[PDB]
Amino acid sequence: KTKFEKVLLIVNPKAGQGDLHTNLTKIVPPLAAAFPDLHILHTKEQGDATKYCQEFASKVDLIIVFGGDGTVFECTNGLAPLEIRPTLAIIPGGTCNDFSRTLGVPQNIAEAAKLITKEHVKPVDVAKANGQHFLNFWGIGKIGYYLSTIETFPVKITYDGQVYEDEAVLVMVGNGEYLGGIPSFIPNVKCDDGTLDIFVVKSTGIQAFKDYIGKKLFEDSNENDIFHVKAKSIHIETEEEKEVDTDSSLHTPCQIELLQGHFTMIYNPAVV
Numbered sequence: 001k002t003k004f005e006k007v008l009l010i011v012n013p014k015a016g017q018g019d020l021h022t023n024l025t026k027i028v029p030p031l032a033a034a035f036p037d038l039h040i041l042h043t044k045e046q047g048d049a050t051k052y053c054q055e056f057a058s059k060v061d062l063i064i065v066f067g068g069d070g071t072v073f074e075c076t077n078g079l080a081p082l083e084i085r086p087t088l089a090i091i092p093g094g095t096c097n098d099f100s101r102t103l104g105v106p107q108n109i110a111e112a113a114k115l116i117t118k119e120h121v122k123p124v125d126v127a128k129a130n131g132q133h134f135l136n137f138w139g140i141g142k143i144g145y146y147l148s149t150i151e152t153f154p155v156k157i158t159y160d161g162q163v164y165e166d167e168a169v170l171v172m173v174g175n176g177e178y179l180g181g182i183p184s185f186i187p188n189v190k191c192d193d194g195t196l197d198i199f200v201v202k203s204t205g206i207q208a209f210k211d212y213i214g215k216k217l218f219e220d221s222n223e224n225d226i227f228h229v230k231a232k233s234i235h236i237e238t239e240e241e242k243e244v245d246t247d248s249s250l251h252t253p254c255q256i257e258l259l260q261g262h263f264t265m266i267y268n269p270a271v272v
Helices: 020-034 048-056 069-079 098-102 109-116 206-212
Strands: 007-011 038-042 062-067 087-092 121-129 132-134 137-140 153-159 162-174 196-202 226-231 233-238 243-246 254-266
Touching: 007 020, 007 048, 020 038, 020 062, 020 109, 048 062, 048 069, 062 069, 062 109, 069 087, 069 098, 069 132, 087 098, 087 109, 153 196, 162 226, 162 233, 206 226
Parallel strands: 007 038, 007 062, 062 087, 087 254
Antiparallel strands: 121 132, 121 254, 137 162, 137 243, 153 162, 153 233, 162 196, 196 226, 233 254
């Protein structure tokens, strides 16, 4: 007997290295075997995943998304503002699959589908920036590309009553544990620790920051060239309005809040 009476699987037909038929041979059978009421819908256009989430949110217990970061993000945005939000699961169908990695989901899609079958679920925090939800990151100054080509601007940050003023080349607020297919360069960021990670690279910390990239660090290095703190309530102000990037249209100034345990998600306890 399962804890998910009704299941929806959303499929992006474009997703996955291989072709639709081959992908579906890998993921559907274990799901169909495990869940006696399973509804499968293909997306057709941008926005469909969001609409399916919103339509089935009160009707199913588990929503599974097969697709890349864009499709996953459609789901996050679809579900986050709703009063009733089923458990969510991801089968990685893009190149980065940042949030699936955060949950320790196998990148082999057959293995990812079988994982869902084990029904291991945990609460995950969801961020809100100026009334916009994000799962992974908020940044001023997507990630897979910006890193590859890795000027200064003043910033003022208030976070739980304290403040930080300085000249920064990059400002980020992290929730997810992976960015651009690899471990987040923000040390000890966690999707479920009840706080957000502020990470600032100062005009002078470019070199040091280059060093952080790639590594999974747990302690900080350059308190002088890089500012890193954890906070629950964050306000970021700049000299001139700047544009914001997330997992979208925001811009400074900006208030950020964290919704603790807002989603429940399937994950891999053998890895995370």
